[PDB]
Amino acid sequence: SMTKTSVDCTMYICGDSTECSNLLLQYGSFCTQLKRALTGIAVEQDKNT
Amino acid sequence: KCVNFNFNGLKGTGVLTESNKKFLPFQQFGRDIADTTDAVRDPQTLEI
DSSP states (O other), X not given: OOOOOOOOHHHHTSSSOHHHHHSSSTTOSSHHHXXXXXXXXXXXXXXXX | OOEEOOBTTBXXXXXXXXXXXXXXXXXXXXXXXXXSEEEEOOSSSOOO
């Protein structure tokens, strides 16, 4: 297996800004695809054990 | 206390803890591994 990780776009993309999260809705639904990819990595590494 | 900051235009969110490391007297602020601000001294006062 590998060490499981998860990246939140509220803190990684925006450095404590409210207006950065307001313009993050203009980019659509990019981060829920990366959240589902990091979840399915974490399920498969739990399935490897 | 989890508050907001305004230190000569520098803004952020965090709590206050005293720094055990030494600092330069002509220094305003320092940087972390990710090159954002980590230790700001009081202009009006001075505690790093």
